[PDB]
Every structure is written in structure tokens, then in C-alpha cells.
């Protein structure tokens, strides 16, 4: 106990403190001023419509409704508290998709009941008014979210997960060519839709046990081109991206079998570092 109070000074030396504190208030004031200045100019260098770089999202990711702790849905068919969190995540997910949720014919456009050619709306300018948004009805996923018609345990007996494609502005998905290299038992709709297929283990020996049924638009397992491109949160808020549900029906119950899901196309690619890029991974165990 020395410096704290001394003759003519507060710890350490306090006569002039007002000078130092004022100086730092002003100096820091001007620093903050400057910084915010530069940030402002930098924000005047930012387009109000499109991001100046999209390149890091280039290989879009494949994502799920019930995003789990680590890619894992483990639950009891009987226990209502077992499937609670997942089912809830589905309800809050597709709460946007409800038919009464998109009423307005001003901002909502009813497009095909069949996958159709890409919907190009002008340019990304504000020259055209706020863009219309293609409607997605829950019925397009049958037996999965089923509107109010079943499941409704939403898979309670046997598991189901909705595959969704990541939104990328201006992205126009190109399905594989009519010349397709080993794309698995997929329908003939390659011209109008981006496909998704699932397997037990990636390229290697699998403990593949299962039988799957997909629900897309029009009966094809995929995403219709008519919803793309996505025009951004400024131009198309209330935009509903495509969805396709994947229902695993027959499976071996008390064991964990692993799943890989893949979207195919020229506009789609995959990373070995990123398992959520261009593709998908889900570990599922239904125990009872």
C-alpha cells in the first residue's frame, strides 16, 4: 500500500489524470470514427442485390429436416418422448410450407404439378419489382408430413427424413446429361429435375439393410428446375426452396446402419473433407 495515495497524487500519479483521460477519450473517439468510416465505404462497395463473391458455396450442400447432434437419429417407436425433438424440428421446418401460409397471389405464383424448365425472372436489378415465388405444397411429400394425413408419427414405425438443397443465389442446377454414368434406379426425368439417391456405405462393403421410397415433385425423386434460380432475400423473401422426403421403410431395428445421400448433376460436386457438400450422411437406429 504505497502508490494508491501519495502527496499530491492518486495511484499512481494523479494530478494530471484529467489530461490523459480526456486525450484517450478524444483519440479513441477518432479511432472509432475512422474505423466506422472505412467500414462505411466498404459497405458502399457492397452490392445491395448479389454478394461480390459466391465461390466458397460453389458445390452446394445437402441438408436435412431433423438436423441431429451428429448426423444421428436414435429413437424408440413406442415412446412419444423419444421422437419428440426430431418431429418438432419437422413441424417448425414445414410450418412455412402450409397451404394457408402462402395465400397471396401477389407474391406467390402457382407453378407446375410437374417438374419444369428453370424460371428466369428478368435480371437481378430492382428495375423489375419484387419477384414472385413458386409455391411448394406439402402434399408433394406423401406419407411424409402428409399434410394432416398421417404419418403422423412422421415415421413413428419406420424412419423418414427430408432432403433439401442449399440456397445459392443465381444457382441454376444442371442435372446429369441424358448420357448418365451409373446413376442408380432413377426415373427418366433427367431433363427437368436434379436427382438424389441413397446407399448404405459409400464405395465400400456396406451393412446396407433397407428399402426406401422417395417423395419429390410429380413423383420423381428430386428438385424441379422451376424453383431456380433463387433470387435472394431482398428480391424473393418468402421463397420456398424445393424439398424431397426420403422414407426408409424396411430396416433392421436394434442395429445402427449408416446412410449416404447424393445429388447428381453437372452443377453438383462432392468433397471428401466436406461430407455435407454435394452429399449427405445419416446414422439411424430405431431401437425397441
Amino acid at each position: 500500500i504505497w502508490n494508491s495515495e501519495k502527496k499530491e497524487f492518486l495511484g499512481r500519479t494523479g494530478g494530471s489524470w484529467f489530461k490523459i483521460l480526456l486525450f484517450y477519450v478524444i483519440f479513441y473517439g477518432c479511432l472509432a470514427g475512422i474505423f466506422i468510416g472505412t467500414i462505411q465505404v466498404m459497405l458502399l462497395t457492397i452490392s445491395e442485390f448479389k454478394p461480390t463473391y459466391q465461390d466458397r458455396v460453389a458445390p452446394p450442400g445437402l441438408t436435412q429436416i431433423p438436423q441431429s447432434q451428429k448426423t444421428e437419429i436414435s429413437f424408440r417407436p413406442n415412446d412419444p418422448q423419444s421422437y419428440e425433438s426430431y418431429v418438432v424440428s419437422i413441424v417448425r421446418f414445414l410450418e412455412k410450407y402450409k397451404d394457408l401460409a402462402q395465400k397471396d397471389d401477389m407474391i406467390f405464383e402457382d407453378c407446375g404439378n410437374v417438374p419444369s424448365e428453370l424460371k428466369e425472372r428478368g435480371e437481378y436489378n430492382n428495375e423489375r419489382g419484387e419477384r414472385k415465388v413458386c409455391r411448394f405444397r406439402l402434399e408433394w411429400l406423401g406419407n411424409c408430413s402428409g399434410l394432416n394425413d398421417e404419418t403422423y408419427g412422421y415415421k413413428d414405425g419406420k424412419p423418414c427424413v427430408i432432403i433439401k438443397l442449399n440456397r445459392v443465389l443465381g444457382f441454376k442446377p444442371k442435372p446429369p446429361k441424358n448420357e448418365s454414368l451409373e446413376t442408380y434406379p432413377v426415373m427418366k426425368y433427367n431433363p427437368y429435375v436434379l436427382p438424389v439417391h441413397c446407399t448404405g456405405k459409400r464405395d465400400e462393403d456396406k451393412e446396407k439393410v433397407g428399402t426406401m421410397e422417395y417423395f419429390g415433385l410429380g413423383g420423381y425423386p428430386g428438385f424441379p428446375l422451376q424453383y431456380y434460380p433463387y433470387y435472394g432475400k431482398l428480391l424473393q423473401p418468402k421463397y420456398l426452396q424445393p424439398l424431397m422426403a426420403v422414407q426408409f421403410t424396411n430396416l433392421t431395428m436394434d442395429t445402427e446402419i449408416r446412410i449416404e445421400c447424393k445429388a447428381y448433376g453437372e452443377n453438383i460436386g462432392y468433397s471428401e473433407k466436406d461430407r455435407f457438400q454435394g452429399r449427405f450422411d445419416v446414422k439411424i437406429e430405431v431401437k425397441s
Binding site: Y53, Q54, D55, V57, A58, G170, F171
Partner: protein, 32 residues
């Protein structure tokens, strides 16, 4: 496509730069 950046010419540029800058620094600290 807008989704392609050329990171190869950038990489190459930064590397050529590194080379030049360094050997130039070597030139500096040896004044003969």
C-alpha cells in the same frame, strides 16, 4: 460461371512475388 474463381493465377502471382521480394532483400543485405 460466377462460381469459379481462379486461385491458381493468384497463387502463382503471390509466389512469384515472394520469390522476388526475398531475393531482393538478399540483394539489400549484401551491399558489396
Amino acid at each position: 460461371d460466377p462460381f469459379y474463381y481462379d486461385y491458381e493465377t493468384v497463387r502463382n502471382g503471390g509466389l512469384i512475388f515472394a520469390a522476388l521480394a526475398f531475393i531482393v532483400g538478399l540483394i539489400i543485405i549484401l551491399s558489396k
